[PDB]
Amino acid sequence: FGTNGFDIPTIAIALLIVGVIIGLSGLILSIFATATASAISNPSPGTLAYNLTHPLINGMVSFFSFFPTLYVLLGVTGIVLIAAGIISIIMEKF
Amino acid sequence: FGTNGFDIPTIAIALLIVGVIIGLSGLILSIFATATASAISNPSPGTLAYNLTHPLINGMVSFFSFFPTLYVLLGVTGIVLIAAGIISIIMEKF
């Protein structure tokens, strides 16, 4: 069901795969992050261990705050792909 | 699901891998830094051992303060990669 490489069943299967992979990723990352939160403690506000450890958790927080826009762009990509498929169909179907 | 090398499932798997590696790194570094903090003591403010040891902990603090911006740039890189993928799709999909 297509012209050259645009196959609606294939597109649906691809959506299946990407959705499942994203759900799995969220699951694994949350489960691991819970363990991370449990492991690290809060020594004191101003002792040696605080100076030693604080920037690491800061970087953790920053990167995990960067994730959302990555996910948003990844979502946007599919609309572009489907759109290109529609246009390619229209171009030479007539 | 792509054109030449841009594969959304592959991108999601890459995000999985990088997130997990970063979480693991933070965990290991914090656990080790706790041991470091426990090991080193505070001899005295002005004796020989203080002169011998203070610059080392200063360098420790400095490098660990350098980590956050490294993490931030590492996070920024992915947006650039996804963006280049979107543009490459758009260029020859039509």
Place this chain on the structure above:
Amino acid sequence: FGTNGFDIPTIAIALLIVGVIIGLSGLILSIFATATASAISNPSPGTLAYNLTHPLINGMVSFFSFFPTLYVLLGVTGIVLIAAGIISIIMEKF
């Protein structure tokens, strides 16, 4: 996840390795310096042993004071590397 040699997982692993090595180095050097401080005594301010020993501890102090800037430059190097990676990606990704 990259173009030619820039791999974000590899970068994260490299950061793991360098951070751990630096922590280990600080630990070992501090532990050894404590033993050094314990071993050497203070004979007298003006006897033969003082003339014999003082410049050595002076050199010790000087070199250990040189360490911090070495560590700072070592930290700076990584930002340059990540930056070059970003630029290299941008150059031919489009």
Place this chain on the structure above:
Amino acid sequence: FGTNGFDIPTIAIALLIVGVIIGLSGLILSIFATATASAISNPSPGTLAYNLTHPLINGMVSFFSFFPTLYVLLGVTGIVLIAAGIISIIMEKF
């Protein structure tokens, strides 16, 4: 019941084995630790035997406090394995 190496009965048997081994380990370690606690006495707070023995029990306590996160990560591994199996099934089942 699978495609290449993913067999749900085999997975269930593996879960059987790991659960039983972990239960056995906890049992043996607790039984032995009771004997350890019974054997060692408390000589005095400041005599020779205290200096001789205290760091050993400190190391005991530390290592046994390290066990929990090891167990948690060991538990996390199975979700990753099952997840990879699901994805591998989905990839070429269609």
Place this chain on the structure above:
Amino acid sequence: FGTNGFDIPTIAIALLIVGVIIGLSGLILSIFATATASAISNPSPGTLAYNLTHPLINGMVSFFSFFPTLYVLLGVTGIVLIAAGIISIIMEKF
């Protein structure tokens, strides 16, 4: 009764096997866990044996709390397999 490798009797037999194995596993693990609970005692809240033994039972509890989601994913896998079978039948049966 199938096309290439999808056999409804074989699927039913596989469901038989997995269900029986899971029931057996639950039975054995519960019976063994009862013995574990009977064996270990509660020495005191703060003595040596408590420090020696508490993290082990903590790890026990954690891993056994991890089991449920493993079972849930294992259950989910079968729907995917049956679904892939249905789609494969539909693809070339017509």
Place this chain on the structure above:
Amino acid sequence: FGTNGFDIPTIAIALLIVGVIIGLSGLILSIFATATASAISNPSPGTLAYNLTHPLINGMVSFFSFFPTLYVLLGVTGIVLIAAGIISIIMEKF
């Protein structure tokens, strides 16, 4: 239950072995140290035997104070090993 050399049952057995060996070591060392403490006496603060014997017990105390950090690092090693196993699974399971 693994890919190449990472076997969760094998890991659990290894944890069994290391925990038991560490418990045994603590037991034997404490029992022997009690005998050492009983054997050596305190002659006098300033006689010949004191000069002859004091540094030996000082070295005893020092080494036994060094033990704890050794144990801590030994504990840290296992988290690294399990982490490497998880990453290796993730790398080529997908």
Place this chain on the structure above:
Amino acid sequence: FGTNGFDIPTIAIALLIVGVIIGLSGLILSIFATATASAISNPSPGTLAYNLTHPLINGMVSFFSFFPTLYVLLGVTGIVLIAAGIISIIMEKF
């Protein structure tokens, strides 16, 4: 009545043998322990014979307290064996 080595009559005979041996063991041990209790006397709480004899009876009590869990595990083993037999039958009977 079986497939390869699983014979229900043989299993029943094995249960016969193990039950009878366990009953005999309990009988003999109790009869002998009565004689032991009769033989040893209670000299005094603090004389030489008390110091000479008390730890022996302590070890007696400890070992005999260890027996119950041994018996429990021995009982658990049979359920595992019968379970493995059932699974082996199911595997290739169909």
